[PDB]
Design a protein around this ligand. Structure first.
Ligand SMILES: [Cl-]
Lengths: 251, 240
């Protein structure tokens, strides 16, 4: 009945520094730009067509979208940007590197934060070095004091992404529009959890590959089969083995 | 507090380098035209400009110009609206011909007429034309009525289909206090300039807008300019 496509952006400049990004507006590295080019070419070779596109207000996802639309010769499509598809907000951890947080905040808190669906990191306070860069950026000036986060658990991120799905994306799908969504890991986890009916435990163990297009075949918007991946069979198998091993090593 | 409006015309295209008529054919920028857009964006960055909403056409040479500018000024998050009403003039049967082939096929007298005329269109693009399916069966125009898809346009025609978008969508945004950027093409921008200044037909046919340079207007509460258009950039570029 309907076809939906998602794509997760690749490596950023702050991933090379092993630093928590969150709402900080870091750009793609050369490797992450290459990953977007490869996913665009896979869509081009298979003949995919879209009618409308959604992304966040962060340049690493917007530049991924731009690269895909260049590759498939569809730069003329309408594009809609929203803060509700941003990455999870990492609070006071924003800007710290990852071997430092265990010394700053303790091994017990690091374990809890990695394990839990509903425990937030510490808040970003006004003396934090990236407070003015993010909380006072004019792109968020139209948010209420309640909507602007100082920190987020996974449950929080999913709870602020799903109203945009429900209210803006679903009516385009029912109208027959072929939709493309270019966003981030945790905001796309929200959509996947809602579509497939996954548990909290399973969705915390699901890490999506980067730069690989994710395809859903859906009248009642229920998946006919689970997510499928577009690309060369061998390159896909290796990326999923890599992501699984990275997940297992963190426990 | 005069309203501030900024326009930019795209630079050199791949088909300019072959001296071929483009029109509604969707040719990309050349490397030099991309470099032009980078210099225009750097001029806006150095002057500290900020925008709230952007408008452009459905053609990739204008869209890529806008993308380059937003990258240079760190405003990639702004909302963007595309419309066919801002497209370049449709050159009809001349699409794809270079100037030599045009003179050989249609003669010198008709060439003088078409170049010198405000309201005489070129020949229509018919179903045997090489580019007829490429343009007139492109799905991006599927929601136009059969009344609206051109087989050819005079300059008068182009201006007549561009101004309804200015009047019905851009003017209310300016009256709400939004800071507007428009990235488009020579002839569609000519329509906006002719309306803003009250220019005659002959005057607008003599006006040639520079490429890749920010063009700035200051407007009063009735949206009339208070002084002539000005330009942003180094001394040499601005003076030229
Ligand atoms: Cl865009």
């Amino acid at each position: 009945a309907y076809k939906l496509v998602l794509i997760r952006h690749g490596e950023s400049a702050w991933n090379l520094e092993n630093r928590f990004s969150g709402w900080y507006d870091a750009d793609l590295s050369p490797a992450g730009h290459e990953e977007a080019k490869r996913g665009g070419q896979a869509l081009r070779d298979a003949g995919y067509e879209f009618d409308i596109c959604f992304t966040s207000v962060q340049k690493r996802a917007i530049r991924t979208l731009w690269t895909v639309l260049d590759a498939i010769d569809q730069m003329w499509l309408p594009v809609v940007r929203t803060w509700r598809l941003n990455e999870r907000h990492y609070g006071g951890l924003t800007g710290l590197n990852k071997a430092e947080t265990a010394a700053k905040h303790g091994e017990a808190q690091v374990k809890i934060w990695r394990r839990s669906y509903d425990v937030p990191p510490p808040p970003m306070e006004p003396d934090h070095p990236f407070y003015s860069n993010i909380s006072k950026d004019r792109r968020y000036a139209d948010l209420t004091e309640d909507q602007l986060p100082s920190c987020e658990s996974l449950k929080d991120t999913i709870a602020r992404a799903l109203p945009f799905w429900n209210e803006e994306i679903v009516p385009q799908i029912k109208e027959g529009k072929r939709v493309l969504i270019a966003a981030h890991g945790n905001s796309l986890r929200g959509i996947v959890k809602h579509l497939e009916g996954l548990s909290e435990e399973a969705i915390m163990e699901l890490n999506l590959p980067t730069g690989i297009p994710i395809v859903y075949e859906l009248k009642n918007l229920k998946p006919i089969k689970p997510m499928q991946f577009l690309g060369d069979e061998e390159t896909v198998r290796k990326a999923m083995e890599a992501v699984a091993a990275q997940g297992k090593a963190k426990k």
